Amino acid sequence: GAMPSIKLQSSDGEIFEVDVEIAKQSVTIKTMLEDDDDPVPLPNVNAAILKKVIQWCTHHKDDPPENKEKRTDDIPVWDQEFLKVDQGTLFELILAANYLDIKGLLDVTCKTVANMIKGKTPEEIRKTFNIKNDFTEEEEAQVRK
Amino acid sequence: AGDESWMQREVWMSVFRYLSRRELCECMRVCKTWYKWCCDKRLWT
Amino acid sequence: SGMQIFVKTRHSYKHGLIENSTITLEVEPSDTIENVKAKIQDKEGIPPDQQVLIFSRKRLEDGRTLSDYNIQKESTLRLVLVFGR
């Protein structure tokens, strides 16, 4: 027979059925199950973002779970290809992985963005993320004190 | 990316936890909001 | 104020780091969902257009009362913080 699963409802309305043990990679969801077989609403995660969350959790299905020096070069090859998406998608992936509290997904996603800052001038970071320079000339001098 | 919303703040401050002292010092010059998020006593300890 | 209910939250609105916390609201059974959200804005500062409330896996629509969802004393709602417009 089948295995216990749970349904998650994106903000857009699409419902996603996921195996419970794959879903319990989200500590936020894991606690709800610890405490109605209708879907759990995620009004802050749209379908595309939730689709990519389930994809990531399905691939890391068989993975066992620091406070040291910072490393961002240790993203597995699969996650790098999977995280070749537009900036907005990455920003929403950090939001979703943060809300769902999936440490692994938040780690690779923030390290992906951190790698688009490493070795770049402040001017190059502005061009990368299309951030305007809201500094006054006098303000840009005090920051460089 | 430069908006002053709670979404932009949660993202970049999640990102700034993975930056070294060198890359943080170059993010403070991007914009006024990044300068404020990079100067909180939790990134330097 | 009649009833007291509980709202569990997971958001980053206070300082910027996401965090869990349950808050207590004083409510009337007649209170509308708008009024519940306005009372959440009073202690949390979150505008009502950025709140979505859920009771027993059901999204609570604004123009209705808590009695319509049978939200009784010491019931627990869920607050999800969403984007503006």
PDB file of C-alpha atoms in Angstrom:
ATOM      1  CA  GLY A   1       0.000   0.000   0.000  1.00  0.00           C
ATOM      2  CA  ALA A   2       0.810   3.713  -0.021  1.00  0.00           C
ATOM      3  CA  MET A   3       2.638   5.737   2.655  1.00  0.00           C
ATOM      4  CA  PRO A   4       1.404   8.621   4.827  1.00  0.00           C
ATOM      5  CA  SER A   5       1.535  11.859   2.861  1.00  0.00           C
ATOM      6  CA  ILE A   6       0.486  15.456   3.413  1.00  0.00           C
ATOM      7  CA  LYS A   7      -0.951  18.058   1.046  1.00  0.00           C
ATOM      8  CA  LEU A   8       0.388  21.617   0.912  1.00  0.00           C
ATOM      9  CA  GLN A   9      -1.577  24.400  -0.736  1.00  0.00           C
ATOM     10  CA  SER A  10       0.425  27.132  -2.437  1.00  0.00           C
ATOM     11  CA  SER A  11      -0.648  30.751  -2.217  1.00  0.00           C
ATOM     12  CA  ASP A  12      -1.859  30.384  -5.845  1.00  0.00           C
ATOM     13  CA  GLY A  13      -4.208  27.499  -5.018  1.00  0.00           C
ATOM     14  CA  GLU A  14      -2.244  24.550  -6.404  1.00  0.00           C
ATOM     15  CA  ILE A  15      -2.139  21.621  -3.968  1.00  0.00           C
ATOM     16  CA  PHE A  16       1.001  19.473  -3.670  1.00  0.00           C
ATOM     17  CA  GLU A  17       0.983  16.030  -2.119  1.00  0.00           C
ATOM     18  CA  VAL A  18       4.303  15.134  -0.503  1.00  0.00           C
ATOM     19  CA  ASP A  19       5.459  12.075   1.434  1.00  0.00           C
ATOM     20  CA  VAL A  20       5.457  12.937   5.131  1.00  0.00           C
ATOM     21  CA  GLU A  21       9.076  11.977   5.826  1.00  0.00           C
ATOM     22  CA  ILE A  22      10.175  14.159   2.912  1.00  0.00           C
ATOM     23  CA  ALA A  23       7.944  16.966   4.232  1.00  0.00           C
ATOM     24  CA  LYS A  24       9.408  16.641   7.742  1.00  0.00           C
ATOM     25  CA  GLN A  25      12.620  18.096   6.325  1.00  0.00           C
ATOM     26  CA  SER A  26      10.721  21.313   7.066  1.00  0.00           C
ATOM     27  CA  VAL A  27      10.845  21.765  10.840  1.00  0.00           C
ATOM     28  CA  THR A  28       7.927  24.184  10.596  1.00  0.00           C
ATOM     29  CA  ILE A  29       5.830  21.433   9.026  1.00  0.00           C
ATOM     30  CA  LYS A  30       7.336  18.746  11.278  1.00  0.00           C
ATOM     31  CA  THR A  31       6.022  20.495  14.379  1.00  0.00           C
ATOM     32  CA  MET A  32       2.495  20.888  12.983  1.00  0.00           C
ATOM     33  CA  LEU A  33       2.363  17.117  12.445  1.00  0.00           C
ATOM     34  CA  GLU A  34       3.663  16.549  15.983  1.00  0.00           C
ATOM     35  CA  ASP A  35       0.664  18.353  17.481  1.00  0.00           C
ATOM     36  CA  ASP A  36      -8.416  17.249   9.337  1.00  0.00           C
ATOM     37  CA  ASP A  37      -6.735  15.730   6.268  1.00  0.00           C
ATOM     38  CA  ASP A  38      -7.234  18.905   4.229  1.00  0.00           C
ATOM     39  CA  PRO A  39      -4.107  20.645   2.886  1.00  0.00           C
ATOM     40  CA  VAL A  40      -2.082  22.977   5.077  1.00  0.00           C
ATOM     41  CA  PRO A  41      -2.253  26.521   3.640  1.00  0.00           C
ATOM     42  CA  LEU A  42       1.010  28.260   2.777  1.00  0.00           C
ATOM     43  CA  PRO A  43      -0.291  31.700   1.769  1.00  0.00           C
ATOM     44  CA  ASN A  44       3.296  33.019   1.604  1.00  0.00           C
ATOM     45  CA  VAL A  45       4.674  30.406  -0.809  1.00  0.00           C
ATOM     46  CA  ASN A  46       3.385  30.456  -4.354  1.00  0.00           C
ATOM     47  CA  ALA A  47       3.223  27.329  -6.502  1.00  0.00           C
ATOM     48  CA  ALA A  48       6.469  27.812  -8.450  1.00  0.00           C
ATOM     49  CA  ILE A  49       8.494  28.363  -5.272  1.00  0.00           C
ATOM     50  CA  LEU A  50       6.787  25.481  -3.511  1.00  0.00           C
ATOM     51  CA  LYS A  51       7.398  23.329  -6.567  1.00  0.00           C
ATOM     52  CA  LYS A  52      11.138  23.995  -6.276  1.00  0.00           C
ATOM     53  CA  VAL A  53      11.068  23.389  -2.524  1.00  0.00           C
ATOM     54  CA  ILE A  54       9.513  19.944  -3.009  1.00  0.00           C
ATOM     55  CA  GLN A  55      12.009  19.210  -5.761  1.00  0.00           C
ATOM     56  CA  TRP A  56      14.924  20.082  -3.483  1.00  0.00           C
ATOM     57  CA  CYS A  57      13.538  18.073  -0.569  1.00  0.00           C
ATOM     58  CA  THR A  58      12.803  15.072  -2.806  1.00  0.00           C
ATOM     59  CA  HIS A  59      16.366  14.974  -4.095  1.00  0.00           C
ATOM     60  CA  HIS A  60      17.813  15.346  -0.584  1.00  0.00           C
ATOM     61  CA  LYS A  61      15.331  12.711   0.647  1.00  0.00           C
ATOM     62  CA  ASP A  62      18.148  10.432   1.841  1.00  0.00           C
ATOM     63  CA  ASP A  63      20.445  12.892   3.655  1.00  0.00           C
ATOM     64  CA  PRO A  64      21.323  12.844   7.378  1.00  0.00           C
ATOM     65  CA  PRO A  65      21.500  16.197   9.222  1.00  0.00           C
ATOM     66  CA  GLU A  66      27.935  24.533  12.704  1.00  0.00           C
ATOM     67  CA  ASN A  67      29.570  27.613  14.255  1.00  0.00           C
ATOM     68  CA  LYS A  68      32.924  27.781  12.432  1.00  0.00           C
ATOM     69  CA  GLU A  69      34.567  29.715   9.587  1.00  0.00           C
ATOM     70  CA  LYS A  70      32.459  30.739   6.605  1.00  0.00           C
ATOM     71  CA  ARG A  71      32.547  28.571   3.481  1.00  0.00           C
ATOM     72  CA  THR A  72      30.388  29.013   0.385  1.00  0.00           C
ATOM     73  CA  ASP A  73      32.252  26.785  -2.111  1.00  0.00           C
ATOM     74  CA  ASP A  74      30.724  23.553  -0.749  1.00  0.00           C
ATOM     75  CA  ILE A  75      27.373  23.586  -2.599  1.00  0.00           C
ATOM     76  CA  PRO A  76      26.823  20.151  -4.197  1.00  0.00           C
ATOM     77  CA  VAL A  77      26.889  20.117  -7.998  1.00  0.00           C
ATOM     78  CA  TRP A  78      23.194  19.243  -8.246  1.00  0.00           C
ATOM     79  CA  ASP A  79      22.106  22.229  -6.147  1.00  0.00           C
ATOM     80  CA  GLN A  80      24.200  24.657  -8.201  1.00  0.00           C
ATOM     81  CA  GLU A  81      22.484  23.625 -11.430  1.00  0.00           C
ATOM     82  CA  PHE A  82      19.119  23.603  -9.660  1.00  0.00           C
ATOM     83  CA  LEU A  83      19.780  27.122  -8.327  1.00  0.00           C
ATOM     84  CA  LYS A  84      20.472  28.631 -11.772  1.00  0.00           C
ATOM     85  CA  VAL A  85      17.298  30.711 -11.614  1.00  0.00           C
ATOM     86  CA  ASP A  86      16.518  34.417 -11.681  1.00  0.00           C
ATOM     87  CA  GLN A  87      17.352  36.637  -8.706  1.00  0.00           C
ATOM     88  CA  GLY A  88      13.716  36.966  -7.653  1.00  0.00           C
ATOM     89  CA  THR A  89      13.351  33.195  -7.473  1.00  0.00           C
ATOM     90  CA  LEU A  90      16.433  32.960  -5.236  1.00  0.00           C
ATOM     91  CA  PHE A  91      15.117  35.731  -2.999  1.00  0.00           C
ATOM     92  CA  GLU A  92      11.793  33.879  -2.668  1.00  0.00           C
ATOM     93  CA  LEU A  93      13.664  30.603  -2.111  1.00  0.00           C
ATOM     94  CA  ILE A  94      15.410  32.107   0.911  1.00  0.00           C
ATOM     95  CA  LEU A  95      12.063  33.399   2.197  1.00  0.00           C
ATOM     96  CA  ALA A  96      10.349  30.016   1.763  1.00  0.00           C
ATOM     97  CA  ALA A  97      13.227  27.976   3.166  1.00  0.00           C
ATOM     98  CA  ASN A  98      13.413  30.374   6.084  1.00  0.00           C
ATOM     99  CA  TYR A  99       9.687  30.178   6.850  1.00  0.00           C
ATOM    100  CA  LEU A 100       9.601  26.391   6.399  1.00  0.00           C
ATOM    101  CA  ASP A 101      12.953  26.220   8.266  1.00  0.00           C
ATOM    102  CA  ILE A 102      14.810  23.878   5.949  1.00  0.00           C
ATOM    103  CA  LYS A 103      18.422  24.483   6.958  1.00  0.00           C
ATOM    104  CA  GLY A 104      19.925  22.710   3.945  1.00  0.00           C
ATOM    105  CA  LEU A 105      17.860  24.640   1.411  1.00  0.00           C
ATOM    106  CA  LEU A 106      18.524  27.972   3.100  1.00  0.00           C
ATOM    107  CA  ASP A 107      22.276  27.236   3.223  1.00  0.00           C
ATOM    108  CA  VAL A 108      22.732  26.501  -0.480  1.00  0.00           C
ATOM    109  CA  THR A 109      20.443  29.359  -1.484  1.00  0.00           C
ATOM    110  CA  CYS A 110      22.176  32.028   0.603  1.00  0.00           C
ATOM    111  CA  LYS A 111      25.584  30.719  -0.430  1.00  0.00           C
ATOM    112  CA  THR A 112      24.510  31.003  -4.057  1.00  0.00           C
ATOM    113  CA  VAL A 113      23.725  34.682  -3.544  1.00  0.00           C
ATOM    114  CA  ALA A 114      26.863  35.158  -1.467  1.00  0.00           C
ATOM    115  CA  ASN A 115      28.864  33.904  -4.440  1.00  0.00           C
ATOM    116  CA  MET A 116      27.382  36.681  -6.587  1.00  0.00           C
ATOM    117  CA  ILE A 117      28.917  39.243  -4.201  1.00  0.00           C
ATOM    118  CA  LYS A 118      32.332  37.674  -3.593  1.00  0.00           C
ATOM    119  CA  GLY A 119      35.114  39.508  -5.414  1.00  0.00           C
ATOM    120  CA  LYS A 120      32.926  42.378  -6.625  1.00  0.00           C
ATOM    121  CA  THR A 121      33.251  46.099  -6.013  1.00  0.00           C
ATOM    122  CA  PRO A 122      30.291  47.858  -4.390  1.00  0.00           C
ATOM    123  CA  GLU A 123      29.630  49.272  -7.862  1.00  0.00           C
ATOM    124  CA  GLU A 124      29.643  45.750  -9.302  1.00  0.00           C
ATOM    125  CA  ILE A 125      27.179  44.573  -6.646  1.00  0.00           C
ATOM    126  CA  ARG A 126      24.869  47.418  -7.600  1.00  0.00           C
ATOM    127  CA  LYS A 127      24.949  46.394 -11.269  1.00  0.00           C
ATOM    128  CA  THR A 128      24.420  42.735 -10.343  1.00  0.00           C
ATOM    129  CA  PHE A 129      21.267  43.262  -8.274  1.00  0.00           C
ATOM    130  CA  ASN A 130      20.182  46.559  -9.906  1.00  0.00           C
ATOM    131  CA  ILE A 131      20.494  48.508  -6.642  1.00  0.00           C
ATOM    132  CA  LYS A 132      20.572  52.303  -6.959  1.00  0.00           C
ATOM    133  CA  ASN A 133      23.150  54.350  -5.055  1.00  0.00           C
ATOM    134  CA  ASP A 134      21.023  56.251  -2.540  1.00  0.00           C
ATOM    135  CA  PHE A 135      24.128  57.871  -1.032  1.00  0.00           C
ATOM    136  CA  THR A 136      24.892  61.559  -1.098  1.00  0.00           C
ATOM    137  CA  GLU A 137      28.471  62.450  -2.006  1.00  0.00           C
ATOM    138  CA  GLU A 138      29.050  63.568   1.580  1.00  0.00           C
ATOM    139  CA  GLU A 139      27.402  60.365   2.830  1.00  0.00           C
ATOM    140  CA  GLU A 140      29.586  58.182   0.597  1.00  0.00           C
ATOM    141  CA  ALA A 141      32.632  59.822   2.216  1.00  0.00           C
ATOM    142  CA  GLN A 142      31.618  59.215   5.832  1.00  0.00           C
ATOM    143  CA  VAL A 143      31.007  55.518   5.111  1.00  0.00           C
ATOM    144  CA  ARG A 144      34.575  55.359   3.765  1.00  0.00           C
ATOM    145  CA  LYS A 145      36.056  56.792   6.976  1.00  0.00           C
TER     146      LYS A 145
ATOM    147  CA  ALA B   1      16.782  44.450  -4.145  1.00  0.00           C
ATOM    148  CA  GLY B   2      17.167  47.950  -2.700  1.00  0.00           C
ATOM    149  CA  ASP B   3      13.606  48.269  -1.355  1.00  0.00           C
ATOM    150  CA  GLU B   4      13.052  48.864   2.362  1.00  0.00           C
ATOM    151  CA  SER B   5      10.543  46.039   2.847  1.00  0.00           C
ATOM    152  CA  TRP B   6      10.602  43.234   5.407  1.00  0.00           C
ATOM    153  CA  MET B   7      11.179  40.784   2.566  1.00  0.00           C
ATOM    154  CA  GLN B   8      14.327  42.531   1.334  1.00  0.00           C
ATOM    155  CA  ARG B   9      15.608  42.780   4.920  1.00  0.00           C
ATOM    156  CA  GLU B  10      15.026  39.094   5.790  1.00  0.00           C
ATOM    157  CA  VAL B  11      16.809  37.979   2.611  1.00  0.00           C
ATOM    158  CA  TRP B  12      19.938  40.101   2.758  1.00  0.00           C
ATOM    159  CA  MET B  13      20.404  39.598   6.495  1.00  0.00           C
ATOM    160  CA  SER B  14      20.092  35.862   5.930  1.00  0.00           C
ATOM    161  CA  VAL B  15      22.702  36.347   3.211  1.00  0.00           C
ATOM    162  CA  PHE B  16      25.027  38.458   5.333  1.00  0.00           C
ATOM    163  CA  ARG B  17      25.441  35.565   7.790  1.00  0.00           C
ATOM    164  CA  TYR B  18      27.452  33.688   5.113  1.00  0.00           C
ATOM    165  CA  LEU B  19      29.745  36.614   4.221  1.00  0.00           C
ATOM    166  CA  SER B  20      33.262  36.978   5.596  1.00  0.00           C
ATOM    167  CA  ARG B  21      34.571  40.159   7.213  1.00  0.00           C
ATOM    168  CA  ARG B  22      36.016  41.197   3.844  1.00  0.00           C
ATOM    169  CA  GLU B  23      32.818  40.835   1.817  1.00  0.00           C
ATOM    170  CA  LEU B  24      30.766  42.553   4.529  1.00  0.00           C
ATOM    171  CA  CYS B  25      33.034  45.601   4.433  1.00  0.00           C
ATOM    172  CA  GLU B  26      32.336  45.935   0.710  1.00  0.00           C
ATOM    173  CA  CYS B  27      28.581  45.506   1.117  1.00  0.00           C
ATOM    174  CA  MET B  28      28.348  48.502   3.442  1.00  0.00           C
ATOM    175  CA  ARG B  29      29.119  50.754   0.461  1.00  0.00           C
ATOM    176  CA  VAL B  30      26.359  49.439  -1.826  1.00  0.00           C
ATOM    177  CA  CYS B  31      23.463  51.454  -0.401  1.00  0.00           C
ATOM    178  CA  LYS B  32      22.125  53.070   2.751  1.00  0.00           C
ATOM    179  CA  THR B  33      20.063  50.018   3.742  1.00  0.00           C
ATOM    180  CA  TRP B  34      22.933  47.520   3.363  1.00  0.00           C
ATOM    181  CA  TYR B  35      25.141  49.812   5.451  1.00  0.00           C
ATOM    182  CA  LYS B  36      22.572  49.579   8.262  1.00  0.00           C
ATOM    183  CA  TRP B  37      22.089  45.819   8.046  1.00  0.00           C
ATOM    184  CA  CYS B  38      25.856  45.165   7.958  1.00  0.00           C
ATOM    185  CA  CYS B  39      26.444  47.297  11.083  1.00  0.00           C
ATOM    186  CA  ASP B  40      24.497  45.248  13.633  1.00  0.00           C
ATOM    187  CA  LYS B  41      26.452  43.634  16.518  1.00  0.00           C
ATOM    188  CA  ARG B  42      25.386  40.102  15.442  1.00  0.00           C
ATOM    189  CA  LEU B  43      27.507  39.779  12.292  1.00  0.00           C
ATOM    190  CA  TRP B  44      30.768  40.572  14.127  1.00  0.00           C
ATOM    191  CA  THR B  45      31.454  38.170  16.991  1.00  0.00           C
TER     192      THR B  45
ATOM    193  CA  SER C   1     -13.241  41.722  26.772  1.00  0.00           C
ATOM    194  CA  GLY C   2     -15.101  38.419  26.686  1.00  0.00           C
ATOM    195  CA  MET C   3     -12.696  35.950  25.082  1.00  0.00           C
ATOM    196  CA  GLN C   4      -8.947  35.501  24.857  1.00  0.00           C
ATOM    197  CA  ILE C   5      -7.486  33.650  21.872  1.00  0.00           C
ATOM    198  CA  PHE C   6      -3.913  32.823  20.851  1.00  0.00           C
ATOM    199  CA  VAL C   7      -2.064  33.559  17.611  1.00  0.00           C
ATOM    200  CA  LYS C   8       1.141  31.699  16.784  1.00  0.00           C
ATOM    201  CA  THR C   9       3.449  33.561  14.412  1.00  0.00           C
ATOM    202  CA  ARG C  10       6.633  32.855  12.466  1.00  0.00           C
ATOM    203  CA  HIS C  11       7.928  36.002  10.772  1.00  0.00           C
ATOM    204  CA  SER C  12      10.876  38.406  10.761  1.00  0.00           C
ATOM    205  CA  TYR C  13       8.941  41.678  11.146  1.00  0.00           C
ATOM    206  CA  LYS C  14      10.260  42.849  14.530  1.00  0.00           C
ATOM    207  CA  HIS C  15      14.004  43.067  13.834  1.00  0.00           C
ATOM    208  CA  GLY C  16      14.768  41.064  10.710  1.00  0.00           C
ATOM    209  CA  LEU C  17      15.420  37.551  11.945  1.00  0.00           C
ATOM    210  CA  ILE C  18      12.652  35.010  11.620  1.00  0.00           C
ATOM    211  CA  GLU C  19      11.324  33.787  14.951  1.00  0.00           C
ATOM    212  CA  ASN C  20       8.458  31.912  16.599  1.00  0.00           C
ATOM    213  CA  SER C  21       6.141  33.427  19.202  1.00  0.00           C
ATOM    214  CA  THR C  22       2.558  33.035  20.406  1.00  0.00           C
ATOM    215  CA  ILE C  23       0.636  36.199  21.278  1.00  0.00           C
ATOM    216  CA  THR C  24      -2.572  36.659  23.265  1.00  0.00           C
ATOM    217  CA  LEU C  25      -5.513  38.696  21.980  1.00  0.00           C
ATOM    218  CA  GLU C  26      -8.626  39.823  23.818  1.00  0.00           C
ATOM    219  CA  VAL C  27     -11.610  39.307  21.553  1.00  0.00           C
ATOM    220  CA  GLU C  28     -15.376  39.178  21.361  1.00  0.00           C
ATOM    221  CA  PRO C  29     -17.126  36.315  19.552  1.00  0.00           C
ATOM    222  CA  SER C  30     -18.779  39.049  17.438  1.00  0.00           C
ATOM    223  CA  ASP C  31     -15.387  40.444  16.362  1.00  0.00           C
ATOM    224  CA  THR C  32     -14.700  40.516  12.640  1.00  0.00           C
ATOM    225  CA  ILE C  33     -11.480  39.216  11.114  1.00  0.00           C
ATOM    226  CA  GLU C  34     -10.633  42.809  10.169  1.00  0.00           C
ATOM    227  CA  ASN C  35     -10.837  43.762  13.840  1.00  0.00           C
ATOM    228  CA  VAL C  36      -8.673  40.792  14.817  1.00  0.00           C
ATOM    229  CA  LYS C  37      -6.086  41.928  12.278  1.00  0.00           C
ATOM    230  CA  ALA C  38      -6.322  45.496  13.557  1.00  0.00           C
ATOM    231  CA  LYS C  39      -5.585  44.214  17.062  1.00  0.00           C
ATOM    232  CA  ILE C  40      -2.578  42.327  15.656  1.00  0.00           C
ATOM    233  CA  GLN C  41      -1.332  45.560  14.081  1.00  0.00           C
ATOM    234  CA  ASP C  42      -1.577  47.263  17.487  1.00  0.00           C
ATOM    235  CA  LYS C  43       0.902  44.959  19.224  1.00  0.00           C
ATOM    236  CA  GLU C  44       2.931  43.812  16.204  1.00  0.00           C
ATOM    237  CA  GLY C  45       2.909  46.792  13.848  1.00  0.00           C
ATOM    238  CA  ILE C  46       2.093  44.562  10.868  1.00  0.00           C
ATOM    239  CA  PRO C  47      -0.401  46.229   8.504  1.00  0.00           C
ATOM    240  CA  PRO C  48      -3.591  44.219   8.002  1.00  0.00           C
ATOM    241  CA  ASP C  49      -2.971  43.886   4.250  1.00  0.00           C
ATOM    242  CA  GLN C  50       0.164  41.873   5.116  1.00  0.00           C
ATOM    243  CA  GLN C  51      -1.585  39.451   7.499  1.00  0.00           C
ATOM    244  CA  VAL C  52      -3.328  36.194   6.620  1.00  0.00           C
ATOM    245  CA  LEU C  53      -5.010  34.277   9.439  1.00  0.00           C
ATOM    246  CA  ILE C  54      -5.750  30.556   9.489  1.00  0.00           C
ATOM    247  CA  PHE C  55      -7.911  28.449  11.800  1.00  0.00           C
ATOM    248  CA  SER C  56      -7.844  24.647  11.464  1.00  0.00           C
ATOM    249  CA  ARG C  57      -6.206  24.719   8.027  1.00  0.00           C
ATOM    250  CA  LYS C  58      -8.865  27.186   6.791  1.00  0.00           C
ATOM    251  CA  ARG C  59      -8.064  30.692   5.580  1.00  0.00           C
ATOM    252  CA  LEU C  60     -10.228  33.210   7.435  1.00  0.00           C
ATOM    253  CA  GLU C  61     -11.958  35.702   5.166  1.00  0.00           C
ATOM    254  CA  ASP C  62     -12.085  39.285   6.343  1.00  0.00           C
ATOM    255  CA  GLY C  63     -15.744  40.286   6.406  1.00  0.00           C
ATOM    256  CA  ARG C  64     -16.797  37.467   8.750  1.00  0.00           C
ATOM    257  CA  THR C  65     -16.925  36.957  12.520  1.00  0.00           C
ATOM    258  CA  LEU C  66     -15.063  34.524  14.764  1.00  0.00           C
ATOM    259  CA  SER C  67     -18.333  32.813  15.725  1.00  0.00           C
ATOM    260  CA  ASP C  68     -18.818  32.004  12.042  1.00  0.00           C
ATOM    261  CA  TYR C  69     -15.693  29.853  12.325  1.00  0.00           C
ATOM    262  CA  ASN C  70     -16.637  28.867  15.886  1.00  0.00           C
ATOM    263  CA  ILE C  71     -13.461  30.431  17.287  1.00  0.00           C
ATOM    264  CA  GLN C  72     -14.074  30.014  21.017  1.00  0.00           C
ATOM    265  CA  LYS C  73     -12.231  30.924  24.199  1.00  0.00           C
ATOM    266  CA  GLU C  74      -8.555  29.916  24.226  1.00  0.00           C
ATOM    267  CA  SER C  75      -8.619  28.946  20.547  1.00  0.00           C
ATOM    268  CA  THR C  76      -5.438  29.190  18.500  1.00  0.00           C
ATOM    269  CA  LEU C  77      -5.166  30.959  15.149  1.00  0.00           C
ATOM    270  CA  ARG C  78      -2.147  31.006  12.838  1.00  0.00           C
ATOM    271  CA  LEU C  79      -0.697  34.242  11.520  1.00  0.00           C
ATOM    272  CA  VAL C  80       1.176  34.117   8.208  1.00  0.00           C
ATOM    273  CA  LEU C  81       2.933  37.300   7.141  1.00  0.00           C
ATOM    274  CA  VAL C  82       2.682  37.962   3.393  1.00  0.00           C
ATOM    275  CA  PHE C  83       3.843  40.552   0.858  1.00  0.00           C
ATOM    276  CA  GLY C  84       2.348  43.962   0.182  1.00  0.00           C
ATOM    277  CA  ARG C  85       0.938  45.155  -3.126  1.00  0.00           C
TER     278      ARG C  85
END
